[PDB]
Scaffold this active site. Structure first.
Site, mmCIF file in Angstrom:
data_model
loop_
_atom_site.group_PDB
_atom_site.id
_atom_site.type_symbol
_atom_site.label_atom_id
_atom_site.label_comp_id
_atom_site.label_asym_id
_atom_site.label_seq_id
_atom_site.Cartn_x
_atom_site.Cartn_y
_atom_site.Cartn_z
ATOM 1 C CG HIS B 88 -2.130 -0.884 1.034
ATOM 2 N ND1 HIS B 88 -3.216 -0.847 1.882
ATOM 3 C CD2 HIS B 88 -2.415 -1.821 0.100
ATOM 4 C CE1 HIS B 88 -4.116 -1.725 1.478
ATOM 5 N NE2 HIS B 88 -3.654 -2.332 0.400
ATOM 6 C CB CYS B 136 -2.061 4.311 -3.334
ATOM 7 S SG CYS B 136 -3.428 3.515 -4.194
#
Lengths: 160, 148, 88, 88, 148, 160
Positions: B88, B136
């Site tokens: 992430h 991200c």
């Protein structure tokens, strides 16, 4: 934060029922750590028609708006007798009685103040929205205040 | 002399690192990372790299793993490297295993570059560091609706 | 002996998305970015360097398809074309 | 009437130095980085795109010569090769 | 279809901006910037860009001039742009004319990218923004000495 | 902050005087906003010789170090009679008397704790350093405590 949840592009009605496909079809998950629960879905006009016409009210309690969808003969969405229905034919130009299924009120949304939700004229307190059904999206009336399932709000993009 | 040096296949000992984060402690799981690791490892193994695969590392352990990778001897005999990352991502950088919104544990890209520079990793002078990151970097669909 | 060299040289980062965007990943097929990246090296690593392979990956995401993203080539400090030459 | 268009789709930054270093400037001849950049655009702009021109500029600073620096190609988001095509 | 579009010479109206900071109120002057301006302008005019020289702008003036450049009606008849920035710089980014240690006045690179995207500059959709920057980003001489 | 000021590469002696060229010859100015006044200059060993030899002291008050430079016959730097001079010939192996121009003491520097300055054995309190002269650099004794002109400090890089 520009919280955006695009879920609509263009789709036609089937079996006298309005269907709407979404931009995503594989249910891809974001790599952002936080959740991304959807709250609105507005975007359209990507190049099967979706009519919106404005009306002037001698008793202005909200801007009068219509929804219609092209058919073999144009069909307008209807709200008679506390149920959702699609009625066929064309509107009779300016509507005489204020209480009608043809006319709807548009209210500005908290999200970016650029889109507006839809309000029933025949119902007071009801709300028009959409909810996830199977692989497509189905426009079904549900009260905005009540959190019915996910309660995706139905809004449309205004002209600049 | 516009191309990089490429050493003999029969004697070179390259090295690559593939760090992926799949299971977390305060974050929804990164499903599908297993196929990602398998495919990336197979591709790099075909390319001619000795793949190192690691999973579920805190950024503190991440840094010491990068240092151990830099200090390994095969680098004297290699001519490149690959550092493929999968986790992430916050706009600051890369999310670790123990990352949370209350206390962040983020591995910045600047730190990754610093741990592999010429000073800290003298073994990789004039050798590419082809870093690959899958994460991200913010909260935005990446598209805007402009009125044509 | 103590010949000088640049502190930071020969780096090519390749992020999945531009800053302040997001990235997608298929639950079973794997990440779309990684899938395109591995496909482009399976098809082009013998005829295009890392810079041009990354450019092809970037171009493959040009036309948006709903869940759109844009690969980014950060801090490209490379000095020469880098051909992997897998097994020559 | 409305498209997606990939906010921040086409971009190529070109910094004078890598992050956390120093860029030099000749007091009379002009900035060394800018001087090399304009020389390479005067010589190569008709046969090499912006990416490869910036790569040539970067390689021209490879071997340190005392006041050393290293150009950096930040946030390269180009999708296609960009030929300036001066006067054509 | 791997090359960006290039239209007719006789009808294209490109626009390239060149910002430089030579004089300062709390910093020693950037001597030699005059030759930089002259050479950059001459080369861009050879390329075919209607240059726009600006000198000694604060970051607020930087931002409003960038917005004015984005809003100019010549972009609709162009295919590219150039933003040559040459001034002092620190780790954060570009230095303005009123920079000081006590109060910083920095035009970040992120802001420059943000104020030229498709949302804020719709006239430049699918058109390169070839930014050129000449500024420092730190203190280190950029070189290190390692025992070989 | 790794404050570094490289000003030495390699250079020979001329006219019985030690000269040293610098890495920069065009006086390029940094684009960093702050000033970069030089404080040390250490780097050498870039591939005209510069001898350093260590000595053991029976009276250890600092590590004993020598400087010499190759000539037609090797020359050692000298500090006799409160002046700077270059004396020729080779050192007589281990020096008997502690007070000599051959032996120098090395003291660690505050900068990175990797380099060391040079201390005279024949002088107590004096200091060996360098100062800008014309286009080259000239090694001239100057007290470290006293800020004489720019007072560039002379240090050498130690072996790891």
């Amino acid at each position: 934060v520009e919280d955006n949840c695009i879920n609509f592009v263009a789709m036609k009605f089937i079996d006298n029922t309005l269907y709407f496909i979404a931009e995503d079809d594989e249910n891809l998950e974001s790599d952002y750590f936080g959740k991304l629960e959807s709250k609105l879905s507005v975007i359209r006009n990507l190049n099967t028609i979706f009519i919106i016409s404005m009306y002037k009210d001698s008793q202005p309690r909200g801007m009068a708006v219509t929804i219609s969808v092209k058919c073999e003969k144009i069909s307008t969405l209807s709200c008679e007798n506390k149920i959702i229905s699609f009625k066929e034919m064309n509107p009779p130009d300016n509507i005489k009685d204020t209480k009608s299924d043809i006319i709807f009120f548009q209210r500005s949304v908290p999200g970016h103040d650029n889109k507006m939700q839809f309000e029933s004229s025949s119902y007071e307190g009801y709300f028009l929205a959409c909810e996830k059904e199977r692989d497509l999206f189905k426009l079904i009336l549900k009260k905005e205040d009540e959190l019915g399932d996910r309660s995706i709000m139905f809004t449309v993009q205004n002209e600049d | 002399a516009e191309i990089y040096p490429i050493m003999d296949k029969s004697s070179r000992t390259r090295l690559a690192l593939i760090i992926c984060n799949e299971e977390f402690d305060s974050i929804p799981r990164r499903t599908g990372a297993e196929v990602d690791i398998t495919g990336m490892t197979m591709l790099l193994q075909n390319l001619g790299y000795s793949v190192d695969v690691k999973k579920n590392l805190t950024a503190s352990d991440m840094t010491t793993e990068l240092e151990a990778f830099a200090h390994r001897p095969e680098h004297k005999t290699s001519d490149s490297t690959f550092l493929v990352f999968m986790s992430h991502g916050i706009r600051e950088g890369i999310c670790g295993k123990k990352h949370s919104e209350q206390v962040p544990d983020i591995l910045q890209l600047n730190a990754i570059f610093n741990m592999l520079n010429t000073k800290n990793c003298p073994s990789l002078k004039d050798k590419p560091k082809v870093i690959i990151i899958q994460a991200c970097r913010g909260d935005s669909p990446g598209v805007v609706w402009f009125k044509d | 002996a103590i010949k000088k060299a640049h502190i930071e040289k020969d780096f090519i980062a390749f992020c999945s998305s531009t800053p302040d965007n997001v990235s997608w990943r298929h639950p079973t097929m794997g990440s779309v970015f990684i899938g395109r990246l591995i496909e482009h090296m399976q098809e082009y690593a013998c005829s295009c360097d890392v810079e041009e392979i990354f450019r092809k990956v970037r171009f493959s995401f040009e036309q948006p398809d709903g869940r759109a993203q844009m690969p980014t080539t950060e801090r490209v400090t490379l000095t020469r074309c880098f051909y992997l030459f897998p097994g020559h």
